[PDB]
Structures are given as structure tokens and as C-alpha cells.
């Protein structure tokens, strides 16, 4: 089954899909084709949990019920540049205004 | 027996299964012999019922609360196909893929009383969009004009 994700780093969000049975490494190959960084230069996270290459997306907790087209799951992304390992940093999106009185 | 979109008084029984595969309370709507819409008992989300209809009888399905249009076997109208060797005819009711605009109008209409539409801080053209509520009559007109234009 398909899982729908948002791969996020700083102010960049990639919208992509993969199978529940596909691995973290295969997801890194998708990011490679878009951002041109090989898998060994990438670290993927679920919240603050670093994701292991050999694990399937389903084993990471990305299922059809938690990673939907209309409500994708967030995958955090940090780059390694040789001896450099940046801290995982995802910039939050903006906030809507306060709900108007006529909508309460 | 006058409009293009109407049931035919066939008097040929046809067993149909109405299956609500949408998260909405469904209102089945039968078009009578004069093409006038008739409300039938509603179907809760996930419910199916084996019902009795007739060959050439025309149906459409709406959200019972808001009259938002729904699909039946991936289309707007349902007329049972040939009832072969007693087999019932299946009518699978689902949500359409609404445009983002239509879906937003639906959500706003569900939260805002019609007297308060014009209090919303949105472009003026959007007040008439909110006020242009889904209606089976306008849909019958669009579907009639589609068929009439198609007859060329």
C-alpha cells in the first residue's frame, strides 16, 4: 500500500509517495534525484528518531492510516557534508489568524 | 411524461442494492414520470439496502443535510442495467473528488449561518459562491443541457 509523505528540512518541503514495504534507503534515493545528495549524505527522522536504512516505511510507523494523500506524514531531513553533521532543523509553517466570531 | 430527465413508467421490476460508501448521510432521489425529484429514506455512512425499483427509473444521490452532489458507480445518474437471471443491480454511492474551491465552500457553509456570510473577510465574489447552494434542480438543468447539446 502507498504512503504519502512530506520530507522537510529548514524551509524546504518535498511532497512524495512510496510503498509501506519500501525502505528508508529507497526514500533516500528519491531525495537524491530531487536534491542531488546521495543517501550517505542524508539522515531521515520521524520526530527526533533517526531512521535506519534497512527498515521499511511501515516498520518506521508510516502506514496508509497515518500517511494519507490529504494528510501526509512528516519525514525530517538533515544533511551530512563530510565531517559536518547539521542539527535537524524544520522551520514551522505560518499560523492562521484567530477563528472569527461568525465561525464559532 | 415530459422532460428529457425522467423515469419511464416501465412496470418492469428491478432489484437494486444501494450501498453508501461515502462518509455522508445519503439522500436517494428518484425522478418521477414527470422528472420531479422525490426524496427516499436516507442511508447512514457505510450502510447498504436491497431496494425495489423498476427498469428505466432514474436516481441521483445527495448529502441529506447539505444537498452536495454524490456519485453512483462513478457518475451522477443511476438507471439500473438489465436484471439478468434474478441478479440484483449494484449502486455504489461515493463522494466525488470535489474541487478545492467547492470543498472550501462546503466547510465554510457548515460553520457559518447564511445571514453571516457577508461578515466574512473574503473577496465579495465569494459571498455569491457561498449563497449558490447545491440544488438538484440546477444539476438536472446542467445534465439536461449536456444531453440536449450532445444530441447536436
Amino acid at each position: 500500500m502507498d504512503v504519502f509523505l512530506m520530507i522537510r528540512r529548514h524551509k524546504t518541503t518535498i511532497f512524495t509517495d512510496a510503498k509501506e514495504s519500501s525502505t528508508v534507503f529507497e526514500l533516500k534515493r528519491i531525495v537524491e534525484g530531487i536534491l542531488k545528495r546521495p543517501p550517505d549524505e542524508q539522515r531521515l527522522y520521524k520526530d527526533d528518531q533517526l531512521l535506519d536504512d534497512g527498515k521499511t516505511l511501515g516498520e518506521c510507523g508510516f502506514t496508509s492510516q497515518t500517511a494519507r494523500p490529504q494528510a501526509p506524514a512528516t519525514v525530517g531531513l538533515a544533511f551530512r557534508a563530510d565531517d559536518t553533521f547539521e542539527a535537524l532543523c524544520i522551520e514551522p509553517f505560518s499560523s492562521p489568524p484567530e477563528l472569527p466570531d461568525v465561525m464559532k | 411524461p415530459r422532460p428529457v430527465l425522467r423515469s419511464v413508467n416501465s412496470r418492469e421490476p428491478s432489484q437494486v442494492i444501494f450501498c453508501n460508501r461515502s462518509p455522508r448521510v445519503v439522500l436517494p432521489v428518484w425522478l418521477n414520470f414527470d422528472g420531479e425529484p422525490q426524496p427516499y429514506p436516507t442511508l447512514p455512512p457505510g450502510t447498504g439496502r436491497r431496494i425495489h425499483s423498476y427498469r428505466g427509473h432514474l436516481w441521483l444521490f445527495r448529502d441529506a443535510g447539505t444537498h452536495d452532489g454524490l456519485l453512483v458507480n462513478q457518475t451522477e445518474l443511476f438507471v439500473p442495467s438489465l436484471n439478468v437471471d434474478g441478479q440484483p443491480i449494484f449502486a455504489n454511492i461515493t463522494l466525488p473528488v470535489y474541487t478545492l474551491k467547492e470543498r472550501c465552500l462546503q466547510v465554510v457553509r457548515s460553520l457559518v449561518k447564511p445571514e453571516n456570510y457577508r461578515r466574512l473577510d473574503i473577496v465579495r465574489s465569494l459571498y455569491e459562491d457561498l449563497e449558490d447552494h447545491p440544488n438538484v434542480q440546477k444539476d438536472l438543468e446542467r445534465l439536461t443541457q449536456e444531453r440536449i447539446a450532445h444530441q447536436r
Partner: protein
């Protein structure tokens, strides 16, 4: 696949499949238009009036639309929180999607 970049008023960059962005009539018109140097199409769109909380939500709609349009898989509802409804309505109206 081919991807495009959509940029919110607050500078968030959303990378989505070109086919998914083409769901918007406004984006379709903007991408079809001539690009830079010899390119005949565009791959980047800047929205100076659509913030990131709304634009991310629009991209989720593009994913939902392409996944469920002409499908036999039962269709779920596209959810919209009350707090984002007005801004999302304004974005959908502008975007023609």
C-alpha cells in the same frame, strides 16, 4: 518525474510533481508560459499572497486529487480545519482548483 517548486509569501519552498501542480488552472497557465533563456516551460512559481500553512494544504489537495480522480478505491473526505477555511477558500479561488 518532473517536479516544480512553489514558494509561499513567507519563503517556504514546496517541491511537488509537475502533474500534481497542473491541477491548478492558475499554475497550469503560469508553467505553460515561456521560461528563462531557451526554456519553453517554467518550473518555479512564487505566491506573494499565499502563506506556507495554506500552500502546504493546497499541495495536499493536489496529491488527494491525482490519487482519487477516476479511481475505484473508495474516496475519503478532504479535511479542512475551521481556522484555515477562509484563507484556503481564497487560495482555491485564486488558483482555480
Amino acid at each position: 518525474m518532473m517536479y516544480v517548486k512553489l514558494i509561499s509569501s513567507d519563503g517556504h519552498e514546496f517541491i511537488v510533481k509537475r502533474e500534481h501542480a497542473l491541477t491548478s488552472g492558475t499554475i497550469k497557465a503560469m508553467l505553460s508560459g515561456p521560461g528563462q533563456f531557451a526554456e519553453n516551460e517554467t518550473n518555479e512559481v512564487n505566491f506573494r499572497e499565499i502563506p506556507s500553512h495554506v500552500l502546504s494544504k493546497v499541495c495536499m489537495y493536489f496529491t488527494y486529487k491525482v490519487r482519487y480522480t477516476n479511481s475505484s478505491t473508495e474516496i475519503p473526505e478532504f479535511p479542512i480545519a475551521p481556522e484555515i477555511a477562509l484563507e484556503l477558500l481564497m487560495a482555491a479561488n485564486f488558483l482555480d482548483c
